[PDB]
Ligand binder design. Structure first.
Ligand SMILES: Nc1nc2c(ncn2[C@@H]2O[C@H](COP(=O)(O)OP(=O)(O)CP(=O)(O)O)[C@@H](O)[C@H]2O)c(=O)[nH]1
Ligand SMILES: [Mn+2]
Length: 307
């Protein structure tokens, strides 16, 4: 029997903010690593494993928007990064693009993870338009470098946060909504790995859907009542925060979890929703889990690739 090790690695300020908020919210069986040039921020990290990179280059400060310094910092700490990753079967690298440490170091961290044998997923933000064109261009180069280094990449443009707030929503509450993309994806995969299903999916199926694929979508939806399966499936695939929507997906892993009432008909309905929304002939990997503790709730987990 296989026991997959999942790790989440925050790189730079926004990545380490996401790690801190995920640890606060509560996650289990997931190991966290914080990587930064900024020593003061690392002192505030809740991560069990902390790597300060680039101290000779930055004297414990951030990289000051210089991605070449963030890249050199990570490269010069390769052995320390390898040691922290060793043993991971899957690594999620999260970082905010546009600055120096995230833009420059995150693609190096991802390359090291993949070289170490981990299935490597990047979840990164693009800067708000109000941060200006140069930051957006620098972030775009980081995204391209990430894409070349990971198995799959999920990009969250921060401008989409402006579509989900009202005029008073606290900035921190908006940031938590972006964190949910990563957190719910990690949780969904962790649950798929650990919980035996009646139509069982495991980590090998995650590897098949994700390995060397490029852009990806990861989503969870939960609903109850009439039309629950369709409603949960639509929620799983319809996040307003994503650069890569479901449209165009050629491969999908879909798991449905429900109670003993889970019907064959509604499983087909959920699968058809995903395929219809992809508007492609999708190569599906389908799973089902019966959790009797659940009563009327249904949970649909989707990972889509092949764009
Ligand atoms: N959604 C979200 N975006 C963030 C968050 N923190 C920063 N950002 C965004 O990430 C981008 C990079 O910020 P940051 O992670 O602090 O960069 P850095 O590379 O570590 C800083 P330096 O350039 O000094 O090394 C910012 O321009 C902003 O768009 C966060 O917590 N949540
Ligand atoms: Mn800085």
């Amino acid at each position: 029997s296989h026991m997959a090790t999942l790790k989440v690695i925050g790189v730079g300020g926004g990545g380490n903010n996401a790690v801190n908020r995920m640890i606060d919210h509560g996650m289990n069986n997931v190991e966290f690593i914080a990587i930064n040039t900024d020593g003061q921020a690392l002192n505030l990290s809740k991560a069990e494993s902390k790597i300060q990179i680039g101290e000779k280059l930055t004297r414990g400060l951030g990289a000051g928007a210089n991605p070449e310094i963030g890249k050199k910092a990570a490269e010069e700490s390769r052995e320390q990064i390898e040691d922290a990753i060793q043993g991971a079967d899957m690594v999620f690298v999260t970082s905010g693009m546009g600055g120096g440490t995230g833009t420059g170091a995150a693609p190096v961290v991802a390359k090291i993870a993949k070289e170490m044998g981990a299935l490597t997923v990047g979840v990164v933000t693009r800067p708000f338009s109000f941060e200006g064109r140069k930051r957006q261009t620098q972030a775009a180069a980081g995204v391209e470098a990430m894409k070349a280094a990971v198995d799959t990449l999920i990009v969250i443009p921060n401008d989409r946060l402006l579509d989900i707030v009202d005029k008073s929503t606290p900035m921190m509450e908006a940031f938590k909504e972006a964190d949910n993309v990563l957190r719910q994806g990690v949780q969904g995969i962790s649950d798929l790995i650990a919980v035996s299903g009646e139509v069982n999916l495991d980590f090998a199926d995650v590897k098949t859907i994700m390995s060397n694929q490029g852009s990806a979508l990861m989503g969870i939806g939960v609903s109850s009542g009439e039309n629950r399966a369709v409603e949960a499936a639509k929620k799983a695939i319809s996040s307003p925060l994503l650069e890569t929507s479901i449209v165009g997906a050629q491969g999908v892993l879909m798991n449905i979890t429900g109670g003993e009432s889970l019907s064959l008909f509604e499983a087909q309905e959920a699968a058809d929703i995903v395929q219809d929304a992809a508007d492609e002939d999708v190569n599906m990997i389908f799973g089902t889990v019966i959790n009797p503790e659940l009563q009327d709730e249904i949970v649909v987990t989707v990972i889509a690739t092949g764009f």
